[PDB]
Amino acid sequence: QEKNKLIADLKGLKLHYASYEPTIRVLHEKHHALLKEKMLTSLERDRAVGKISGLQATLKNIDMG
Amino acid sequence: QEKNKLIADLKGLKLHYASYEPTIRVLHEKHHALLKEKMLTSLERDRAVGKISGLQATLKNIDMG
């Protein structure tokens, strides 16, 4: 009976980790969603900030005179 | 004999399982901090929008003369 329960637990751990690997895929699509909005949005943000500041300074000191 | 063979196979199985486990746990936590960085990024989007609102009202001010 001990070895019977041992084989039962063996299969249980097998299925437990074969169903764990789906959450590795789930985190895969999660960091994919990270890929959606992490870098191109940040790149466009920083370049927009730079150009906005530059043209702000230009127009402001143009009009101040 | 059967329990020894089962022991060997289960030990190998669980060795690679426990190789996978810390990787996915630290992946989860670093993913949480990545989402924190996402929140940071969205906040810089918001402050950039505030700066461009400043730009638009100041340009209306320079337009009126």
């Binding site: 637990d9 751990l13 437990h16 169903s19 764990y20 789906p22 959450t23 895929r25 789930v26 | 022991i7 669980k14």
Partner: peptide, 29 residues
Amino acid sequence: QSLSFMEALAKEDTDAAVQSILYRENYIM
């Protein structure tokens, strides 16, 4: 996110029982 995600959360929550059973089996061995 799907039933895979809820199952993963449940097994992560029950990982304490999972690790307890793992340690019990190792101690028996």
